[PDB]
Amino acid sequence: GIDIIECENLLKEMNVQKIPESSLFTNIKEALQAEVFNSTVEDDFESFISYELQNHGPLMLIRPSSECLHAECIVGYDSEVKKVLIYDSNTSPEWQSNIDVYDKLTLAFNCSICGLYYDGVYEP
């Protein structure tokens, strides 16, 4: 992982911004406070991830690690197998289970810098 200052500098140099508020993002952030992964919130999760990938494109997730942070990039979704395609940013992205990704978002949203970011350069 990387320290806060290196992380701040990364986001600045990338020129990314936090994703905007939406009903789907509101609903998922509520769930992430306390709800364990389940079939019902999975629908909310899939709706949110698909919406963000469709409208904003790749999403950079900054989450806590030490006081170190991890930057990961969400870049795909497969509803058939319930997996998310993610870079641990190394060279090639990998498919991760929805439960693992949901648990990562719980860390990021349950650290002002933590959250999800998008890049206007890659906006669909």
- Cα separation values, 16 from 39, 62, 63, 88, 108, Å: 32, 12, 16, 18, 17
Alpha-carbon torsion 25, 31, 34, 36, what sign? negative
Edge-to-edge strands, sheet with 69-78: 17-18, 115-118, 59-64, 69-78, 83-88, 94-97
Sign, CA dihedral 67-77-36-48, equals: positive
Beta carbons of 23 and 29 less than 8 angstroms apart: no
Give the residue extent of every domain in the chain.
1-124
Quickly count: other Cβ atoms within 10 Å of residue 106's Cβ.
Answer: 17
Report how far residue 45's alpha carbon sits from residue 64's, in angstroms, rounded to the nearest whole number: 20
Hey, CA dihedral for 61, 107, 28, 76, is it positive or negative? Answer: positive
The DSSP output letter for 97 is: E
Q: What is the resolution of this structure in A?
A: 1.6
- DSSP-derived secondary structure letter, 122: G
Integer distance in angstroms from the first to the last C-alpha of the chain? 29
| Distance in angstroms (rounded) separating the CA atoms of residues 115 and 13 | 17
Dmax over Cα atoms in the chain, in whole Å?
39
What CATH number should be reported for the domain whose range is 1-124?
A: 3.90.70.170
Give the H/E segment covering residue 9.
Answer: helix 4-14
Q: How far is CA 71 from each of CA 30, 41, 79, 87, 108, rounded to the nearest angstrom?
A: 22, 24, 24, 9, 11
Measured CA to CA, the distance from residue 45 to residue 106 in angstroms comes to 12
Report whether 72 contacts 88 (CB < 8 A): yes
